[PDB]
Design a protein around this ligand. Structure first.
Ligand SMILES: [Mg+2]
Ligand SMILES: [Mg+2]
Ligand SMILES: [Mg+2]
Ligand SMILES: [Mg+2]
Ligand SMILES: [Mg+2]
Ligand SMILES: [Mg+2]
Ligand SMILES: [Mg+2]
Ligand SMILES: [Mg+2]
Ligand SMILES: [Mg+2]
Ligand SMILES: [Mg+2]
Ligand SMILES: [Mg+2]
Lengths: 63, 76, 71, 50
RNA sequence: GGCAUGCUUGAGGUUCUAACUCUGGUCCGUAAUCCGGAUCGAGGACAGUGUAUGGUGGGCAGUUUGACUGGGGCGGUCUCCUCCUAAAGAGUAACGGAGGAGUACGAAGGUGCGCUCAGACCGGUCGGAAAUCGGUCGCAGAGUAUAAAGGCAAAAGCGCGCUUGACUGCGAGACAGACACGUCGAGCAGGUACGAAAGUAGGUCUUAGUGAUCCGGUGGUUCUGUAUGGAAGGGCCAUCG
RNA sequence: AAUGGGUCAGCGACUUAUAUUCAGUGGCAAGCUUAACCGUAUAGGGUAGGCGUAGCGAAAGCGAGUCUUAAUAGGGCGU
């Protein structure tokens, strides 16, 4: 196949049958500042936004 | 000496005017220290933010001594 | 890993659903060892699963609808 | 405001993390807080995060 | 304690010749003195040469040196907070006018119980325009850890007693918003602190006090662990530069 | 009072190949289709392999559900 994907976006974005999962950000290396209401609302695994679907689905070769 | 440096305009104001219909936990007023007081069925959160607790219609009535502004929600 | 729907158990011959029997038909790839069976409809006939391990709902269908689950 | 750890009393490796001005108050603290492993309150004491 | 001398070996000193060296002598190949070979002479385990490593090295090479800018150079400015410009909803520019932050606090947090300001004035020993005391008048002109704005008698201001809710798993619904980030939160389940009990408590009157990812560092965790049984290395959780 | 061109006649600028996505029109249909290579060779054989018919989870794993959690409580994703 003459269509190579990008290796970074294949590690940042797992794919399920309900969109693209991704881990949240900002949670590393300075954590004694933040509030517990803010920490546990960044622990989950969200799904990608509609403005960002057609950008990533060209980086991942899905077009 | 030189002076630019403004800030980024926190978007305050009053939402949900005098005849609306509200849900359980909507935001009524994004206050900056109690222009409006906690009326009958509203909340008054951490930074003095009025929010609902029950359903109905917003009132905006002036009550009592000190002439203070009470935002109550009426089951009507 | 692979898995077989309960509806596709009628798609083999001989009524002995071995591990090589599913490779005899094209219902499974080569180089596949561990296989499950999950509930995805009616079975169709009377078979004998062996070598493969079904779920909770599939085993309650095959043992009820005239089959047998041995090893 | 140097930052410190608060290792639990019981055998769990659960800890809290806060800061403490080492300049004015030299000695430790024995604050009784919750523990998510034994599911009850115990007392903590530690410093020296490294 | 140390001697007796070996077993060895490191490091320093002297001497010897047999390695290597001679851009020394005269024979031979040769009709040549390049190159060899033979033989005396000198130096001699040094010099020199491989390979591993320090130092010096514009001798030489590949390259880097931001933007806004009433031309660009000089100077000033790059992020966050409050007011004005801003036209009585939000938003909104200028090298437009004015100011602040890159933190404190184990009580300056929670709770129950109490209590009122500044200032003026009269009297009162060393103070005197002023200190502490008593009195009337007050009607927040004081105070708020920290700038200004908006607030504060259920005082959000002041004192006392006990304490750790500066809790863990969550979170319907909304506000904002290109995105990444943000802000408020009823209620439910755990286990708590005060109060006789209703009840209050998921930090501080609110809004500034901060920096992604990648790498590494430390605590918990069979979730995997390249024939097998373990380990190393990962993964997830918590947390550092 | 910015650029270009003295006129004529010839030539002179969105292509191809391999992968993939969306629409138009067709074949068979819980199934559709073969690549090399064989072949009396545009037929025919070749179903290896691919995409589907089921997901959730970092993973083991469990499955019309599963993950987080002390919870079988809520909530995310799915039919
Ligand atoms: Mg982490
Ligand atoms: Mg196959
Ligand atoms: Mg010379
Ligand atoms: Mg140079
Ligand atoms: Mg420039
Ligand atoms: Mg306005
Ligand atoms: Mg207007
Ligand atoms: Mg205070
Ligand atoms: Mg009181
Ligand atoms: Mg092994
Ligand atoms: Mg011309």
């Amino acid at each position: 196949p003459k269509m190579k994907t990008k290796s970074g976006a294949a590690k940042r974005f797992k794919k399920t049958a309900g969109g693209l999962k991704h881990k949240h950000a900002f949670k590393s290396h300075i954590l004694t500042k933040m509030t517990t209401k803010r920490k546990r609302q960044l622990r989950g695994t969200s799904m990608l936004n509609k403005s960002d679907v057609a950008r990533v689905e060209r980086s991942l070769r899905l077009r | 000496t030189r002076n630019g440096r403004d800030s980024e305009s926190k978007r305050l104001g009053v939402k949900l005017f005098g005849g609306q219909a509200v849900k359980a936990g909507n935001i009524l007023v994004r206050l900056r220290g109690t222009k409006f007081h906690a009326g009958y069925g509203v909340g008054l959160g951490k930074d003095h933010t009025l929010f609902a607790k029950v359903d109905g219609v917003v009132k905006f009535e002036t009550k009592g001594a000190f002439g203070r502004k009470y935002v109550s929600i009426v089951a009507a | 890993r692979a898995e077989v729907r309960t509806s596709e158990l009628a798609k083999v011959e001989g009524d002995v659903v071995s591990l090589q029997t599913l490779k005899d038909a094209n219902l499974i790839n080569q180089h596949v060892q561990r296989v499950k069976v999950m509930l995805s409809g009616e079975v169709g006939r009377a078979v004998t699963l062996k070598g493969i391990a079904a779920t909770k709902g599939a085993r309650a269908a095959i043992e009820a609808a005239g089959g047998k689950f041995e090893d | 405001r140097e930052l410190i750890r608060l290792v639990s009393s019981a055998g769990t490796g659960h800890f809290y993390t806060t800061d403490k001005n080492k300049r004015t108050k030299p000695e430790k603290i024995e604050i009784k807080k919750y523990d998510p492993v034994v599911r009850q309150h115990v007392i903590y004491k530690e410093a020296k995060i490294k």
